[PDB]
From a paper:
The alternative pathway (AP) is activated by C3b, which randomly and covalently attaches to primary amine and hydroxyl groups on a target surface via a thioester group located in the thioester-containing domain (TED). The main AP regulator is factor H (FH). Bacteria, yeasts and even parasites utilize FH for protection against C. Typically, microbes bind FH to their surfaces to prevent C activation. Borrelia are able to recruit host FH and another host C regulator, C4b binding protein.
In our tripartite structure, OspE binds simultaneously to C3d and FH20. In our structure one asymmetric unit contains three closely packed heterotrimers with a water content of 48.8%. Consequently, three tripartite arrangements were selected for further analysis: A:D:G (trimer 1), B:E:(H) (trimer 2), C:F:I (trimer 3). From density it can be seen that chain H is clearly present, presumably at low occupancy and/or disordered. For PDB-deposition the H-chain was replaced with a short alanine polypeptide chain allowing the assignment of H-chain sequence to the structure deposition. The contact surface area between FH and C3dg is 830 Å2 and there are 14 hydrogen bonds in the C:F interface of the C:F:I trimer. FH binds to the side of the C3dg α/α barrel through helices α4 (residues 104–118) and α7 (residues 170–189). The contact area between FH and OspE in the C:F:I trimer is 674 Å2 and contains 13 hydrogen bonds. On FH, the key amino acids R1182, E1195 and R1215 mediate binding to OspE loops β2, β3, and β4 and the interface between loops β5 and β6. Our structural data suggest that the C-terminus of FH has a dual function: it can bind to surfaces and C3b simultaneously and facilitate down-regulation of C.
Author numbering:
A (entry chain A): 996 to 1285
B (entry chain G): 42 to 170
C (entry chain D): 1104 to 1230
Write the structure that this text describes.
Amino acid sequence: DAERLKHLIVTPSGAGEQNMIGMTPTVIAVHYLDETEQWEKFGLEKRQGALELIKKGYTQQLAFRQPSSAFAAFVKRAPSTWLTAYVVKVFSLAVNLIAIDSQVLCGAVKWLILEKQKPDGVFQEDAPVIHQEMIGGLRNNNEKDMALTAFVLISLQEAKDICEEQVNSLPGSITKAGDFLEANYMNLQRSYTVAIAGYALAQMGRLKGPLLNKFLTTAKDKNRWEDPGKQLYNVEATSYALLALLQLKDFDFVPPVVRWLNEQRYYGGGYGSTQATFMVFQALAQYQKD
Amino acid sequence: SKFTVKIKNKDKSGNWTDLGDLVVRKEENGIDTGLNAGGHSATFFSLEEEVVNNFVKVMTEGGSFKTSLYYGYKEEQSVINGIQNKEIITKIEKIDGTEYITFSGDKIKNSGDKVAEYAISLEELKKNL
Amino acid sequence: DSTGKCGPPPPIDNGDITSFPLSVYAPASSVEYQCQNLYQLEGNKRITCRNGQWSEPPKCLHPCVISREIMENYNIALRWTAKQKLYSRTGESVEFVCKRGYRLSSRSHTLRTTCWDGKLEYPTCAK
């Protein structure tokens, strides 16, 4: 770690989506190093330089914020539910690193609630991203409602503290989404879905009893949450699942999981890396914080 | 047998906005049409066997026919229960250089006498006959 | 009616204010409401702060969720679409058929129902 991460400090460039793909590694790189206190194995002169790229990224991304406080690849393109949820996800972590306008964040939050949440708590994507590689394991069509509702719900919960005061509707929305995940969770078949909705429910303290049993009995060899397919998806799934375990405070299950992720030698970066990169460092940072 | 044609309608501002899709089903006592507009998924209007040929003609050129029962979209009065023997009078209109089949339905509930108008592509109506 | 300042606007179920909430509102200041995706705002979308009190806020009229669980239980099915879930808005109508093999046990008109504040009258079929 740290010496490897040199490639994660990238200059954000491109449109509504491409600026985020490039912003992501720099933000989670600074976030991971900060918690892991690994600026000794890295230096101090780059911290100020890396914060400039995060400021650069935030500013550049603001050109893609629409009047509806939503985000899309271009100002004339229909807004992506996913990308808005992701912009919230990233910006929620970045509020502690750089200066994020709370209204920019809570405006996007409110938009997801008042426009893209369905009556049964489902979050729907009406303008899919152009760069499907950045969405990660969500690419799989099977159980999309469950996976997306969990993804968006996670973003609302990450933002909850900063936006609780500004968005009165926020807890009502979190519950409605939670109710959907809690209802259709036992019928889940994909390890990715059990993992992601596991973390979303754990955050609400709703991953209990049979649901909690399912989440834990889905893990292969009590260390990983995996499905046959891309390994990136399996790294991303076990990262959400680790984050869920840390929420449950199940420190008796957590060590084999952590070893498995460190064994994967995944240091982020690359095409389609966006979720795995953000998730594995968010999870491993949170693990050392606890 | 059965086919689906995309349908547009005049909103509050009078601008032609996408409504949904119209399912045209041929049965044993005429043609029953169904409207699929988001959560709305019920009969739009029904016909008798004796209107079938006249309907096809009117939907591909312009003119008028009698429907056994007419419902329309949620805006109209006819939606919940339906109005019997309603006439559908159609015209060929051009929206952004593309020719459609424009038709008036029923009045917008409580209002100052304003009927709802829908439009269905003349191309797709000819393709599925 | 007074120089009475108001507190933050009243909360509404399945909706929120189009602006960011202040703690104190001046007299004659007004906020606007927006309901969630398929919820119909019933009442005034704009509430004024007059005489140190807020106007009556609106209600978000519930849409109807038509799940395949419900349709399988009443031995019914959507007539016009292949969809297994449908989110009908308040005022939107929905037409079913008796799932192949079953006959209608409810009244004949009950095959077509309209959504009203989350309540859609499903018909019954039996065999």
